[PDB]
């Protein structure tokens, strides 16, 4: 649904060591199947693919779609022009079943939404119009808060895409908070823990998955998006967890009706030792503490863990070549109280709750 | 009737420019150099019979001619045209141009040739004057006609030249490992002027549907397509003929009510073609002509010697060649070109074949 990007991102993406899938631009929607298009989309298909085919990070092309673009036009210039790269003519609860036992290997799209930060809410809307809830009524959106979702065309509705947050922050939490700050810090918290579950739900479930592609990191507009950051830089609270569960190696658990599974994933081509020690927030009693050997390019298993009563958090510290790293996890089943679950965060002594 | 416009031509050559010649003011406008050249034939066998490249067969003098793939290449002669009546239609004809080059009559342009390996036919019908007529054909630098295309990936690289990749020449005249590399230019074969009239043969395809060769009978249909005015609809007849040494064998006459027609000619007496060894190659004259029924005036006459023979190609489940429903063990050579400088082919293919007769091949592959 984007252009295709200039060549200074693809000299980026070579220098940072991020390969590069690239769909060709058509969206959600199928095509012509008559010569005018197929004329006018080879000539674009063999223009992007000579300006790009000598960038190391770009590995693959696709159709993002019997049908003559995705099967004839689009793979006869890769045919052509580039035949040393792959080309594929197409692509609630966080814990729900949906999720945890969807049987591909390669997840290509996943998202959850998140409020921006209040910074963010206080540039993009009036004054008056700061607060989502219209006449204090929590739930109903006013009109500046509807267009941000976004409304394409100015029809003035109620509900449709911003009911998401609320839907998502009425499961976890079990009520909306009226408060702002508090929605604020409820909404991009659904965000936080259910984008971080995906990945380490991936990471934990190697050599079977094989990647993980979320959505999105950053948004081209002042809107309200499941982003994990906004177009004027305003991290989300995702971003944060996101971030302690994508290192090279990362320590993590996986949810098991036995208790907890700590893990360890390696997507490096070394092997790393370290000491990993997991203890309890609310109580601070130490769960475990040992060393561990995370072998490379695998997922390596370390403990099963005793199992919790009740809600609360594990923090999960590990050092390794004489760097400290964090995550933790969220144990017991919503509906959590949304007071309890911001003390464990600020105690975790991880993020910020800014 | 057929009149040949092979003989003396006269061959102006220069190097192309950077804007390559297309008209005939800016060919005579081009300083070049001036020879009388042969059609058919190539440039370089002119110029050597002017002094002025040197046997190529001989030492390295093949890269001697190596600056002449950039220039530009005019050809022109005076012919007679003869005098059409109404209706006829006079076709000029060439058998060979190599390569790229724009084809004039009367100052007035007729076509333009992009294929060195096929034949180019012209209706000149409504552009000849009356007597001596003007023919020009200014061909410009196969080589540099590459540089007209971007080329895909995989057609760089190759032992094929990139040069022959975008154009329709033959790949071997660029260079080979078992020919030179002479890409060379000209008029290669036959020019000839046609006169045909309203009604006249546009294809005559033989095919040979069954063939029973131990009850010497044969089904052969003829898949004709003619040029028919409406007025001479259901007053044509087309007389087919099929001979041996002389002796008639089948003749069947039917009305031209449409202009494609196909006639089943149910054969008896005549025997199968076959492959060196395994039989006679058994050939019969196939002739058919289009005449008038109240007149009796012939418009038109195609003749071939054609066999009646069946082909099937069983793929094992490693090919074997099925002719007229016996395997023929196929033993032959690969057919490469006869000369460099291809003008010259119709003088060593009568020799040439003679070394398959005497190897007593039973097949040959003409290489791509």
């Known amino acids: ?354 | 009737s057929e009149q040949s416009l092979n003989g003396r031509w006269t061959l102006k050559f220069f190097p192309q420019p950077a804007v390559p010649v297309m008209t005939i003011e800016g060919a005579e406008a081009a300083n070049g150099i001036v020879v009388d050249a042969v059609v058919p034939g190539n440039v370089e066998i002119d110029m050597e019979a002017a002094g002025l490249v040197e046997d190529p067969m001989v030492g390295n003098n093949i890269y001697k001619l190596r600056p002449y793939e950039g220039y530009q290449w005019y050809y022109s002669r005076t012919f007679a045209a003869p005098v059409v009546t109404e209706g006829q239609r006079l076709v000029l004809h060439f058998g060979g141009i190599d390569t790229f080059a724009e084809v004039y009559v009367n100052g007035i342009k007729v076509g333009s040739a992009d294929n060195m390996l096929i034949e180019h036919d012209y209706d000149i019908t409504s552009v000849v004057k009356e007597g001596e007529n003007r023919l020009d054909v200014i061909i410009r630098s196969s080589v540099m006609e590459a540089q007209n295309h971007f080329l895909g990936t995989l057609s760089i690289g190759n032992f094929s030249n990139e040069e022959s990749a975008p154009v329709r020449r033959a790949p071997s005249t660029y260079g080979w490992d078992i020919m030179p590399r002479l890409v060379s230019a000209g008029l290669w074969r036959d020019v000839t002027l046609r006169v045909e009239n309203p009604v006249t043969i546009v294809d005559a395809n033989w095919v040979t549907l069954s063939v029973n060769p131990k009850a010497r009978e044969a089904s052969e249909s003829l898949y004709l397509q003619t040029r028919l005015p409406f007025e001479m609809h259901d007053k044509v007849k087309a007389v087919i003929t099929i001979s041996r040494d002389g002796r008639q064998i089948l003749r069947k006459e039917a009305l031209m009510r449409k202009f494609a027609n196909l006639f089943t000619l149910n054969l008896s007496g005549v025997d199968a073609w076959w492959p060196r060894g395994y039989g006679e190659p058994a050939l019969y004259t196939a002739e058919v002509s289009l005449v008038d029924v109240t007149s009796g005036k012939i418009y038109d006459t195609k003749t071939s010697k054609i066999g009646f023979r069946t082909v099937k190609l069983e793929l094992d489940e490693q090919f074997q060649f099925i002719i007229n429903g016996e395997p023929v063990f196929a033993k032959g050579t690969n057919w490469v070109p006869l000369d460099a400088l291809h003008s010259r082919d119709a003088s060593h293919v009568e020799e040439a074949v003679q070394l398959m007769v005497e190897m007593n091949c039973n097949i040959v592959r003409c290489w791509g």
């Open chain 1, 1 to 354: 649904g984007n252009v295709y990007e200039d060549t200074h991102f693809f000299e980026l993406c070579d220098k940072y060591g991020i390969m590069v899938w690239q769909d060709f631009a058509m969206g959600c929607g199928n095509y012509s199947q008559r010569d005018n298009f197929a004329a006018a989309l080879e000539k674009e298909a063999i223009s992007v693919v000579v300006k790009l085919r000598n960038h190391p990070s770009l590995i693959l092309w696709s159709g993002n779609n019997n049908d003559r673009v995705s099967r004839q036009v689009l793979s006869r210039v890769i045919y052509e022009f580039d035949p040393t790269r792959p080309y594929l003519p197409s692509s609630g609860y966080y814990k729900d079943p949906f999720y945890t036992e969807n049987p591909s290997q390669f997840v290509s799209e996943i998202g959850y939404h998140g409020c921006p930060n209040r910074e963010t809410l206080e540039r993009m809307f009036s004054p008056d119009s700061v607060n989502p809830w219209q006449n204090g009524v929590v739930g109903m959106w006013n009109d500046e808060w509807q267009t941000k979702a976004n409304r394409i065309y100015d029809d003035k509705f109620q509900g449709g895409r911003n009911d998401l947050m609320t839907n998502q922050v009425r499961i976890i939490f079990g009520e909306v908070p009226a408060d702002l700050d508090d929605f604020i810090f409820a909404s991009q918290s659904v965000q936080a823990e259910a984008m971080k579950f995906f990945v380490e739900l991936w990471r934990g479930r190697r050599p079977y998955r094989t990647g993980i592609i979320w959505w999105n990191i950053r948004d081209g507009w002042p809107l309200l998006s499941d982003a994990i950051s906004d177009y004027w830089g305003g991290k989300k609270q995702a971003f944060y967890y996101m971030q302690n569960v994508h290192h090279d190696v990362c320590c993590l658990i996986n949810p098991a009706a036995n208790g907890y599974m700590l893990k360890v994933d390696n997507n490096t081509l070394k092997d790393f030792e370290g000491v990993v020690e997991v203890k309890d927030v609310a109580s601070g009693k130490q769960v475990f503490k040992g060393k561990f050997v995370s072998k490379a390019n695998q997922m390596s298993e370390i403990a099963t863990l005793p199992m919790q009563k009740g809600q609360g958090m594990l923090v999960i510290s590990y050092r390794i070549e004489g760097n400290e790293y964090f995550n933790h996890y969220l144990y017991g089943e919503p509906p959590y109280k949304l007071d309890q679950y911001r003390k464990w965060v600020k105690k975790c002594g991880i993020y910020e709750l800014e």
